[PDB]
Amino acid sequence: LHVDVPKDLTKPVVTISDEPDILYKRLSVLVKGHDKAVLDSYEYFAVLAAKE
Amino acid sequence: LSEYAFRMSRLSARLFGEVTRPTNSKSMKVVKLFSELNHHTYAELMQTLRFLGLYR
Amino acid sequence: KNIFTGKRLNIFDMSLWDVEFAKQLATVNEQPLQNGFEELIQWTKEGKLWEFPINNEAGFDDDGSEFHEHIFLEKHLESFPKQGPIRHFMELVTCGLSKNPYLSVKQKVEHIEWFRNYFNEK
Amino acid sequence: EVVIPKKKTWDKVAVLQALASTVNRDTTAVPYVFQDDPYLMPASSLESRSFLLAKKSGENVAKFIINSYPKYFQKDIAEPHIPCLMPEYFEPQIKDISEAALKERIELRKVKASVDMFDQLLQAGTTVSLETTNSLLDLLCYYGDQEPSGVTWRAKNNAERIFSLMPEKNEHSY
Amino acid sequence: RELPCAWKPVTYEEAHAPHYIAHRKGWLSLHTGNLDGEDHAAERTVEDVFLRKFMWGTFPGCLADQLVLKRRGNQLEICAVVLRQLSPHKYYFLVGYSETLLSYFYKCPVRLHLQTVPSKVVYKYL
Amino acid sequence: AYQVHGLLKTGDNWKFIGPDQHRNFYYSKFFDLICLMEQIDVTLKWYEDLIPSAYFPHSQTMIHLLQALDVANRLEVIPKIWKDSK
Amino acid sequence: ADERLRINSLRRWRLSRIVFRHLADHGQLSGIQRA
Amino acid sequence: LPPRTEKMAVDQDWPSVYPVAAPFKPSAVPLPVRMGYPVKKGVPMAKEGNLELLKIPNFLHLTPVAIKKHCEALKDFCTEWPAALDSDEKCEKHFPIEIDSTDYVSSGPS
C-alpha cells in the first residue's frame, strides 16, 4: 500500500486487572526436532523476540 | 531396625498416603492393579463416495 | 446551517423473528477473509484451533472435583466391615484407587459400590 | 519492597489481532480467498465469481454427503471436542403424537411435518398449549406455508386456518 | 505370433533411493509423533495413509508429484503438486470438497495448497 | 470521494462495502472519479494500489484511465496498461 | 472388562512390517531414515 | 499467465506478502533459489515445481523486519518484573517456594 492505507486501527483491549500476577523465576523451553537447521532458525527467532 | 524408626516410617506412610500397615509385597499387587487404568469407517467412505461420482 | 437543526415531529421525548433478524444483521458485516491472520482469528473464535499458550488440560475440569475427593476415598468404606479382612482388602483397594490419575471420582465411587454389592451377595 | 504488578487480561484473540494490525494489505496479490497459483488466480470479475461459486458448491456437496451419512464421521478424535465439525441431524427424533413432537418439528422448521403433527394432535383430542400454537403460527407466517429454501399470501392457507382454530387469541398471535 | 517372437523418466523423488531420505531426499509427511516422548505416531501414520489414498483418488491423473502433509497443532496442510490439464473450476470444486470432508473426518482444520505445474518436472532418466 | 474512502477505512468500516457486486460498483466509480479529476501520478498510484487486489476492473475503467493519460500527455505508459488489460 | 478386572482383584506404528518399509523407504514416515 | 513476482517492487513491504506461516510459492517468492544435487553437467532444480523447497518448514513469514514489527506491537501486552528482585539472592529470600509445572506442544487433533 502506497496511498491506500487504513486510517485507524482497532488495537486489542488489554485491561489492567486488579489481581496480582504470577512471578516466574525461570522458564525453560526445550524444543526437540529432527533437523538442526530448523532448530537453529527457531533459536534465532526466539532469542530475537525475547530481546525486543 | 529401632522401634522408633518403624513407628516413624508408618507415620510417614500416613503423611504421604502410602499404605501404613505393611502388607508384605504379595498382597500389594492390587495396589499396582488400581494404580493404572477402523477398516469399516474407511471402507464404506471410499466406496460410498465412489457411486456419488467423486472418488476414483 | 446544517440539516441537524430545524423542525421535528415533536411527537415523543426520550422468538423466530428475533433470531432471523439477528442472523440478517450478521450478514451486514459478512465479508470474505482478507488474509491469513483473519483466518486464524475466525477459526479460533469458531473453536477450531487450539488456544495459545497451549494448556494440556484445556476443556477438561474433572467435574470440578478437588484433590481430597481423589486422595481420601476411605469415606466410601463406612458400610463395610470395620475390622475384618474386608477392611484390609478394601482399605488397600482405596489406597490403590487414590493413586490413579486416569479416573474421575465418579468411576472410583461406582467401583467401590460394585465391591459393596459383590460382598453383600456373598 | 516487592511490588507485584497487576495482571493484564486480554480477550482470546488479542495477540492475533495485534499481529494482523501490524500487517497491511498486499497490493500485488489477489484476495486471500483465491489460490496464489498463476493458473488459478482469476483474471476477471466474472471468472472470480465463477471460481467462488464452484468453491461453495464443493463445500455444499461436502456438507450434503456428511449430513447424509453421519455414521462415518461420528468418530471424534479431537480434544477439546469441536461441535461445529459434528454432523447435523435434520430428522425428527420424537415419533409419538405429543406436544413435544410438535415443538421438535417447529424447532427443525419442518412446516408440513409441524402442520400434520398439529392436525394429528387435534384428531387425538389433545389440547395444544398457547405457546406451542403461537410458535407454529410464527413458523407459518415467516415461511408462508412453504418449506425453507417471493411467496404471495394465499387466502385460507394453513396460517389462517390455525389462527381461526385457536380457542384464545392473544397479542402475539395477531 | 510365436513365443520366440514375443520374447524411463523419473522425478526427483522417484530418482532417489531410500537411503537418501536424510542426505538428498527429504520427508513428505512431517509431524512430531515419532519424537522421543511424543505419542500417537501410529495414528499419524494411519492418517497419512488414508489421506494419500484419498488425495490420489480425488484428483486422478492431476497430481504430478507426491503430497506434503504438514502439521501445526490441529492444522493439517496438504501441499500437493498438480497439473494444468483439468479445468480450474474443477480444481476449486474438488479443493472445497476435500477440505470439508477431511476436516469432518479428522475433526481438525484441514487445508489444501495446490501447486499447478505445466508438466511433470523430470530430474533424470532411469 | 476521499472523505468517503477515509470513512470506509476508519476501523472496521470496510465490512460495510457489501457483496461483490456492490464492491465492484463502488471501486469502479471511485477509480473513475480519480481518473477524471486527479493529476496523473496519483491516478497511477491508486491504479497499482487498487487493481487487482481490491477489484477486477472493467473495460470502461480502462478507457477512462487511457483518457486520463491522454489529458496528461503521458502516452509513454500505455503499453503497461495494455499488458494489464490483456 | 471392568467386571473381569474386579474379580481378578478379589483373587509403534501399528502397520505391517512391509507396509512400514514402503512408507519408511519412500520417505513417508517422518524422521525414520536408514542408518 | 505470468507469475506475480514480476510486479513486486524491489522496495516493497515483505511482511504483507506472507503475513503468516504459508507454504513455499515459487510464483510469490521473488528469489531465484535453487535446491537439489545437480546431475552430471547439470544444475540444481529450479524453484518452479520443486518439491524439496516446498517440503522445507520455511521462515519467510518470520523475517527480522517482520519480527521487530510484531514485537513492537506485542509490547502492549507485557508487565514489568518487580525491580526489587534484582537477582536470585533476593528471589529465594522474598519468595521461597518454587513450583515447577510443565506444558507440552505436540501436533495432532488432541
Curated annotation (Swiss-Prot), chain C:
Localization terms from the record: Mitochondrion
Signal peptide (UniProt feature, chain positions): none
Protein family: Belongs to the mitochondrion-specific ribosomal protein mS31 family.
Subunit structure: Component of the mitochondrial small ribosomal subunit (mt-SSU). Mature mammalian 55S mitochondrial ribosomes consist of a small (28S) and a large (39S) subunit. The 28S small subunit contains a 12S ribosomal RNA (12S mt-rRNA) and 30 different proteins. The 39S large subunit contains a 16S rRNA (16S mt-rRNA), a copy of mitochondrial valine transfer RNA (mt-tRNA(Val)), which plays an integral structural role, and 52 different proteins.
Protein known as: Small ribosomal subunit protein mS31
Parent sequence residues shown: 248 to 383 of 395
Swiss-Prot record, chain E:
Species this chain originates from: Homo sapiens (Human)
InterPro entries: Ribosomal_uS3m (IPR026146)
Similarity comment: family membership: Belongs to the universal ribosomal protein uS3 family.
Cellular compartments annotated: Mitochondrion
GO biological-process terms attached to the record: mitochondrial translation
GO CC aspect terms: mitochondrial inner membrane; mitochondrial small ribosomal subunit; mitochondrion
Record protein name field: Small ribosomal subunit protein uS3m
Coiled coil: none
UniProtKB/Swiss-Prot annotation, chain G:
Cellular location(s): Mitochondrion
Superkingdom in the source lineage: Eukaryota
Quaternary structure and interacting proteins, as annotated: Component of the mitochondrial small ribosomal subunit (mt-SSU). Mature mammalian 55S mitochondrial ribosomes consist of a small (28S) and a large (39S) subunit. The 28S small subunit contains a 12S ribosomal RNA (12S mt-rRNA) and 30 different proteins. The 39S large subunit contains a 16S rRNA (16S mt-rRNA), a copy of mitochondrial valine transfer RNA (mt-tRNA(Val)), which plays an integral structural role, and 52 different proteins. Interacts with LIAT1.
Family statement: Belongs to the universal ribosomal protein uS14 family.
Disease as annotated in the protein's UniProt record: Combined oxidative phosphorylation deficiency 38: An autosomal recessive disorder due to mitochondrial dysfunction and characterized by perinatal hypertrophic cardiomyopathy, growth retardation, muscle hypotonia, elevated lactate, dysmorphy and intellectual disability.
Name of the featured protein: Small ribosomal subunit protein uS14m
Organism of provenance: Homo sapiens (Human)
Gene name linked to the record: MRPS14
From Swiss-Prot, chain H:
Location in or out of the cell: Mitochondrion
Domain of life: Eukaryota
Oligomeric and partner information: Component of the mitochondrial small ribosomal subunit (mt-SSU). Mature mammalian 55S mitochondrial ribosomes consist of a small (28S) and a large (39S) subunit. The 28S small subunit contains a 12S ribosomal RNA (12S mt-rRNA) and 30 different proteins. The 39S large subunit contains a 16S rRNA (16S mt-rRNA), a copy of mitochondrial valine transfer RNA (mt-tRNA(Val)), which plays an integral structural role, and 52 different proteins.
Family: Belongs to the mitochondrion-specific ribosomal protein mS35 family.
Protein name: Small ribosomal subunit protein mS35
Organism: Homo sapiens
Portion held of the full protein: 53 to 162 of 323
